[model samples]
Target: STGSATTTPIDSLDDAYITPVQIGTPAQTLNLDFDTGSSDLWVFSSETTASEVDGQTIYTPSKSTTAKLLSGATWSISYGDGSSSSGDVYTDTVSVGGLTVTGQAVESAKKVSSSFTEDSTIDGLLGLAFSTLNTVSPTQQKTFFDNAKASLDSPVFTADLGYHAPGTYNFGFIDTTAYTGSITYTAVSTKQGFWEWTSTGYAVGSGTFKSTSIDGIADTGTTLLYLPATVVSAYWAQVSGAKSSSSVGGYVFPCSATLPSFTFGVGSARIVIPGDYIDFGPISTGSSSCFGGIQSSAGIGINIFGDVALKAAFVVFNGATTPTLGFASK
Candidate 1:
């Protein structure tokens, strides 16, 4: 069996990608962010505080005859961007695209941060990370992918993210036509419960490729690319008027600056990110300074290869006994 879903970027800035999900026996459909960075299948639901809810579509588990409360089970998650949501858990029928899971854990948010209330583009999040990272108490619930993997034709899924466009996520089989060139496979370390892998090296624009192993996680939930300070500095130095501003929070430069492309190696294969992708956008509406899509992960502890990098290639997450990640240029 297999499942395929179309993920659409929430806005022109590509803040996040959201996909349709069907929950409950009656099939209440809601658009949710399919996040690989975190493990928690939570939603804005009837159980949520009415005051906290804005325009988000709410899932009413009470209306689903198949729904059953997971007694004592609760979940809470806080993102690096400072947004958070938490709630109680319930088991119900959940489907994405055409794939169905009979007893999937569906957390109903009781409280949500203000950031979520303001963003009506997403109703909730469907976590694609390892089930071990689930925050549900009493019994850590398995992710939708984990529960469906055993019955799938192959225990794998692929992420084909786009820049300000719609992309596809396929489960159980790789779409040969989705990408070009041969896929570069690399061993993944699940030690941290993430799609963690190391890149052979990187290059700023057409410059020489540096030979250094940079360990990072492929997080589709995050908005930008974050690398080591040394790498970030080298890239920004090439820009005409780039500066690391404390007030601006990160690196910013003239909107007209000619930003260089970024390339990272997966084994012998190189994936190139266009210079325009790194330009991000103006810091503010009509502002002359633009924030960089690539920034230093010095304060983040671990480097993150987020949407900025993922959109440059097709990614395959192989959930076999010994996991591996595959990357191909698109």
Candidate 2:
């Protein structure tokens, strides 16, 4: 679909938090997350005790003489996945890919609890989205793009997600060699964050539910594409000989044949989700058959189109010029 972008699946690993650049000086290395959902780069600090920031790689401020502590400006963040972190603010020279930005504001989480902290691989998240959703407001809302936009050679930021391999996320210029044609560009809504658009409608296979029109958000942070109840039921109806079983609090289905194609409309753009995403394997008892990308959210207010749908197309978040999002391929 037009609104959805492609992403390469990257495996989580320990001791893989190394970035080529440093945060303040040549001595301090910065751990960054290639996050698409939110904006802002955060890391754990040396002042944080191992007991509080367990299982996370801590960046020592003493390593860089230029690190500056933000007086009384404490920061805290909580994710929708029931993860939380809290800490103080700090300003330091941040670097990425040999590019350095002086006095870059970063959050130093003193306490962290969630998969983000428990996982030994991902130390801090580097948000590549829009600045509207930045957690740090008032004091500092300008994220990486805001800080480095002037220095960037190009107005676009592109990410090439490898297919279960090591992928590269490039900033500034688009790697035209990775794409087939000239990239398709979409003007972004100036509202904020990674400007997401609502779904005009959806259809699964040959089944079309006129009443299934709904709104959804495209998020790379999540792994699955969630749908509304009406849309979910309508989609499963078209699966030939498809049987449903309850597992992981959602319905599962199975079919040997290639499932029908599903498409989501966003204004004039139509994003088509492939059938492979619908043919998920059996992971639980009863029937292992489950929906690959389409699943229920119990009763969540919003539908999040996650990585499974995003991996199919290349996405660009252009915060350099006007707040806009463009789509292309890798």
Could you say which candidate leads in TM-score? 1
Q: What is the lDDT of residue 296 in candidate 1?
A: 97
Q: What do the candidate models score in CA lDDT, each in turn?
A: 0.93, 0.61
Q: Which stretches of candidate 2 lie over 4 Å from their true place?
A: 1-21, 52-54, 190-192, 199-215, 238-247, 254-261, 265-272, 277-291
Model 2 C-alpha lDDT per residue in residues 174-208, reported as the tens digit of each score? 66677554455555444535556555687676655
What would you estimate as the lDDT of candidate 1? 0.93
Model 2's alpha-carbon lDDT is: 0.61
lDDT of candidate 1 over 22-67, digit per residue (tens): 9997999999998888889999999889998989999999999999
